């Protein structure tokens, strides 16, 4: 299995749909290595829950929490963490307004080597319970022989790329993780790292982050050959008064680069209503009426969540993915799993007459390119050489009576799976 792309375990589906799935307890288990230390990058944390996901024999090993909380929320997290002597925190500078530390990544240092896990889930119980989430697991990276001169770098430049990502934080506690990574051999890595970092980027530095980074990788490591673009996410930013402001202009342009129908997959109210969680699934789909009313145009691009292939049509997506299928959806030119939702905050927006790229947030994803496996395309695995697309193709358009899930208006005409209504406030 060259991909090492996994779904999280979902409670309440048949065990066969969980056979190739991972729970966080599985990822942290002693079978994956003998843990010495770890770093947990995320947006939301439940520290008490998190500590319990480690095996008992590892709960006292040092853990670093990399978060973006400020003011009282920062105090709250510190208060959550204090009982646990082995836990330190690193506050990622968020100098630009409305930015978040959204990256989900684990750095796992073992006696036997090092592991990097890039995924989509918050560190809270609900994100790992009945949601569709994605996980990429690096291989066990061995330590570089203390007698040898080697870079430990991969053809995809992952190791240098990961270090640059950590370096942009300018944080003392991450420097030690940068040093740990220097000492390991990441040469077997076959994915490309796509990061976002807060800032305003000029000149050559545009290509470093966000959708311009993606464009650059697609230009350099893909080749050309009516191939649609698919985008799938759980949050939706303010995209502008119409499709030309950003979505189809800069965003789609990066996405269609190689060496055009746009499908956006976002849960409808019906999708959420009849989910395993019911309406409270909508608590993790934060599309607000204030945003939605400004951009009604966007919703004609919307398609329903359907994942019969993985038995997860009722497990609401918190995974975010982007890809480039052929016109019949039997193959793909590339696949990206990432923390980045559909927003300028996460992907970047061009400022100052197109000379500046502005990103508000930390985001991180892995890109699977057929060239990194020596192929020209991946065949799509129809039932979850062939890439495991976790949801159904082609995507199904919203019916005439469907609306996108909007989290801050009430739904009281029909009960959900558990016989409840939804009245936020």
């Amino acid at each position: 299995n060259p991909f090492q792309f996994y779904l999280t375990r979902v409670s309440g589906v048949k065990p066969k749909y969980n056979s190739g799935a991972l729970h966080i307890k599985d990822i942290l288990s002693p079978l994956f290595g003998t843990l010495v230390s770890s770093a947990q990058f995320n947006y939301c944390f439940d520290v008490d829950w998190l500590v319990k996901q480690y095996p008992p024999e590892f709960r006292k090993k040092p853990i670093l929490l990399v978060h973006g909380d400020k003011r009282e929320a920062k105090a709250h997290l510190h208060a959550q963490a204090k009982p646990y002597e082995n836990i330190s925190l690193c506050q990622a500078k968020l100098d630009i307004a409305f930015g978040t530390h959204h990256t989900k990544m684990m750095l796992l240092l073992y006696e036997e080597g090092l592991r990097v896990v890039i995924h989509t889930s918050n560190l809270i119980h609900a994100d790992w319970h009945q949601k569709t989430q994605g996980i990429w697991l690096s291989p066990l990276y061995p330590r570089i022989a203390d007698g040898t001169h080697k870079s430990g770098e991969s053809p995809t430049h992952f190791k240098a790329n990961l270090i640059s990502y950590l370096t942009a934080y300018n944080a003392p506690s991450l420097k030690e993780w940068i040093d740990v990574i220097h000492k390991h051999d990441l040469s077997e890595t076959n994915v490309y790292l796509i990061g976002s970092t807060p800032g305003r980027f000029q000149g050559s530095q545009k290509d470093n982050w966000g959708h311009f980074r993606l464009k650059k990788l697609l230009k350099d490591h893909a080749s050309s050959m009516s191939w649609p673009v698919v985008g799938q996410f759980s949050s939706v930013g303010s995209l502008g008064a119409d499709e030309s402001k950003w979505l189809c202009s800069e965003f789609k342009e990066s996405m269609l680069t190689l060496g055009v129908p746009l499908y956006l997959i976002y849960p409808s109210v019906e999708n959420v209503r009849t989910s395993l969680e019911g309406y409270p699934a909508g608590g993790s789909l934060p599309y607000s009426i204030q945003t939605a009313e400004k951009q009604n145009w966007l919703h004609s691009y919307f398609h329903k969540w359907s994942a019969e292939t993985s038995g997860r049509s009722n497990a609401m997506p918190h995974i975010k993915t982007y890809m480039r299928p052929s016109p019949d959806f039997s193959k793909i030119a590339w696949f990206l799993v990432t923390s980045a939702n559909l927003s300028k905050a996460a992907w970047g927006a061009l400022e100052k007459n197109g000379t500046q790229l502005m990103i508000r947030s930390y985001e991180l994803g892995v890109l699977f390119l057929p060239s990194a496996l020596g192929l020209d395309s991946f065949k799509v695995k129809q039932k979850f050489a062939t890439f495991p697309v976790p949801y159904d193709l082609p995507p199904e358009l919203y019916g005439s009576k469907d609306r996108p899930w909007i989290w801050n208006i009430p739904y009281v005409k029909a009960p959900d799976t558990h016989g409840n209504m939804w009245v936020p406030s």
Binding site: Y43, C44, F45, D46, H67, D69, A73, H76, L77, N122, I124, A126, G283, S284, P286
Partner: peptide, 5 residues
């Protein structure tokens, strides 16, 4: 932060 809410 324990959630979006």
């Amino acid at each position: 932060k324990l959630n979006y809410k």
